[PDB]
Design a protein around this ligand. Sequence first.
Ligand SMILES: *Cc1c(COP(=O)(O)O)cnc(C)c1O
Ligand SMILES: *Cc1c(COP(=O)(O)O)cnc(C)c1O
Lengths: 349, 349
Amino acid sequence: QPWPGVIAAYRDRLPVGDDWTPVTLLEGGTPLIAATNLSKQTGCTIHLKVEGLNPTGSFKDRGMTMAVTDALAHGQRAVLCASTGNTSASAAAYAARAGITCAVLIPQGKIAMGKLAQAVMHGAKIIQIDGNFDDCLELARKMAADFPTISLVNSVNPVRIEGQKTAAFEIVDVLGTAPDVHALPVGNAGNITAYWKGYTEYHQLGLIDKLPRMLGTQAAGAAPLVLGEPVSHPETIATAIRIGSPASWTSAVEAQQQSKGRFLAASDEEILAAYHLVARVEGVFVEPASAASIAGLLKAIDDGWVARGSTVVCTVTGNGLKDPDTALKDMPSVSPVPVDPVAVVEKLG
Amino acid sequence: QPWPGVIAAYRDRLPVGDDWTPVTLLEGGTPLIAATNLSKQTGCTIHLKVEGLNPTGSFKDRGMTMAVTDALAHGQRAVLCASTGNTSASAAAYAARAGITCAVLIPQGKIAMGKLAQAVMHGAKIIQIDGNFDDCLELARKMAADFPTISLVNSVNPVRIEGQKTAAFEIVDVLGTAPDVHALPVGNAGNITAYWKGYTEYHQLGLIDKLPRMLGTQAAGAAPLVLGEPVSHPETIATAIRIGSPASWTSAVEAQQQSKGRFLAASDEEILAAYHLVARVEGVFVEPASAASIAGLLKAIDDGWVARGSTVVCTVTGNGLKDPDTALKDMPSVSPVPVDPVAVVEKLG
Ligand SMILES: *Cc1c(COP(=O)(O)O)cnc(C)c1O
Ligand SMILES: *Cc1c(COP(=O)(O)O)cnc(C)c1O
């Protein structure tokens, strides 16, 4: 009775022919954990969609099966993207399994090799550019439009969004309905878009009656969807949402406007508080960007934007294991305590 | 169609009273991945039981779900661990979800902080001691048996093994039979013991005609079971199997004896080869101990000990994301390249 490809599990809902060979690491089918302790504390009933348990440790895997399978079927020789993030690790894994070249474009200056390690493990070719992060985007786009054998797998890839919409399907599949509000973090806004595409596809299929309110959280230092303008120098420890200029700007706002949803900023402190909260109280280890979403849900419950007793799924987008640096910092100082059994046992209970 | 807790999926084959409420993070039910390219080069059909997609990033969640449920039920207010490894993270998370204290005893001097971040992220109390790794094992054992509310969660805990056998169940549930050989890494030998318990349990219950030959790999520098005697100063990049003295030395040898199995050493180099190989060829980012399992499987297929065209399940025990440091080592640094899209396209092909 095991989980198959997200492609296989939802084929009749995805744009794939009968001919193609789905290349999958059995992504999706991820836990939906009852946040019993967050629920008691709020008064709302909160589930966690835990996407860190996808093959590469983030939800990008839902897009890549789809992007890479479509690439294979369409006879592409290379899969390209231009960021140091979870996109590249996810892209590189699926390209490796397909047997396809994977290139990651990066800007000049200092390289965070910690970021790229997982992807280079999978065979990604890293290519550093005489220029900045814009040049990377401009380059990757020009190549994709010049070489129909390259497939740019960035946020705005229609196939990626199709794959990613399935997280919405699973939530309903197990609950029997949508939540009252779905809360997720927003960087490029590809995900909020996908969930909204997903929920509306089920409503259109007559599988729910109520649609959720999409709550998207941005870090205060990179909150262009909150402030209504692009951000010149995005600034947040939640690296995955360190975006001053979302790729899927239009689609995010449409989702917000159509779902009667909200965009909301959380400060780094508040993100960090959530970061610790989930781990300390739910037993779930979540990446800072994933924490931001909880940080925002919580912020919204105070405000009263989300009503007491309503049902909420909070997408927690990546494994805490993605980011050891942040785990290391703000740790309690342990100093040697004497070796007798009685002293140590009182330092507890 | 959601996967519940190991406890819930296999409640009838696990020792849990029916007053006891399972403390679970929806662990287990992990992908069984067809290793297509590994098979091409091998001449066998090989599956990878990918255990890095458990909540805390390791197979130990299978055991820890039981131990902490058992702990919660028997009115225990603290669990105690004496290891910095994956045990303590797995222990700490289930302790958090259950709302009990998790405490880790560390030796004098230099604190291995990276290794403990996950644990303390789930709220483990690190207690540094005026002693040795050996004096640490003793203080815990003493504290355990002088306070009936403190449970020691080490590897030899029979409750852990019960939870850990359930992997064998999943393999048979999904394959329809047991494989011809089951390959896995061996540290304290709890897992190899546990798988063999699982296969026999399913033999005793009538679900398989024949039991798999258990193949267990250790690192060449930490190979007490291959070498026949214990090892004083174990040495290997594979931290998780850096054990000179298995806690389950007895029941491991029994598993090998009665499964007609084999213990094998693999060099550090060979383990690295495999680590890179699964990532580059399957798309599975696997932690070095997990790599060893594979490496030793590969070594045995060439040795001839593994019959041509037989079936193998290789447990890949932990997530590559558990070991960022190894991911860094021996990684190509590419240098800056001219911006024009022509200078990039044939640096691919
Ligand atoms: C990519 C990513 C995000 C941001 O998602 P968008 O679709 O760009 O809004 C958030 N969290 C994690 C872990 C990420 O991988
Ligand atoms: C603990 C562990 C092992 C070794 O398991 P044993 O039962 O001690 O042999 C191997 N790999 C990983 C990832 C582990 O955490």
